[PDB]
Amino acid sequence: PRRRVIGQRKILPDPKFGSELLAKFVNILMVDGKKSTAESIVYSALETLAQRSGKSELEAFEVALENVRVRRNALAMRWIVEAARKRGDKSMALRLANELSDAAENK
């Protein structure tokens, strides 16, 4: 970093929606290299956000992303995941869905 000035890696996007930004979101929640169990929680959390908390699933995540703002998007997604773990609900898909609901209404 003192001499070695290089860029940052560009991972493959979301296979479901074609979103580059959502591919970085599932990697933060992913622990122990478990991609298969991480993306199932994120997909089920957004479907709760889409069907019962407002349409335009890709736009509904962006409104929740906008209030908590490369590094600006990185710190915003990290604050959602880490605050979702310390909640009172039952599952990780239910906790992160309520965090995106609160971030959409900036509270």
Partner 1 sequence: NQYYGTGRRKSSAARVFIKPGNGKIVINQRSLEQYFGRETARMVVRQPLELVDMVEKLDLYITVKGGGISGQAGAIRHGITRALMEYDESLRSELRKAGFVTRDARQVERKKVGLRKARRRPQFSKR
Partner RNA sequence: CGGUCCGGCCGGGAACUCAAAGGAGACUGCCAGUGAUAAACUGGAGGAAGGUGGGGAUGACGUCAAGUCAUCAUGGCCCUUACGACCAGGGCUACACACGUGCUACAAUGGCGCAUACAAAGAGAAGCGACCUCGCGAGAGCAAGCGGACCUCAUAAAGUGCGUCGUAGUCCGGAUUGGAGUCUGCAACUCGACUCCAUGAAGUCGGAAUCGCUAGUAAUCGUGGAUCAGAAUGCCACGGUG
Residue 29 binds to RNA (criterion: CB under 7 A) = yes
- The region of 23-31, 47-55, 62-70, 72-80 touching RNA under the rule CB under 7 A is 23-31
Specify whether the CB–CB gap between 41 and 29 falls below 8 A.
yes
**Residues with Cβ < 8 Å from 14, sequence gap 6 or more?**
20, 22, 23, 26
Nearer to RNA, 38 or 104 (CB): 38
Question: For residues 45 and 47, what is the distance between their CA atoms, to the nearest angstrom?
Answer: 6
Q: Does 70 bind RNA (CB under 7 A)?
A: no
Residue 64 token pair? 């929740």
Is 51 near RNA (CB under 7 A)? Answer: no
How far is 84 from 96, CA to CA, in rounded Å? 5
Does residue 15 bind RNA (CB under 7 A)?
Answer: no
Residue numbers at the binding site for RNA (CB under 7 A) = 1, 9, 27, 29-38, 40-41, 81, 85, 88, 90-93
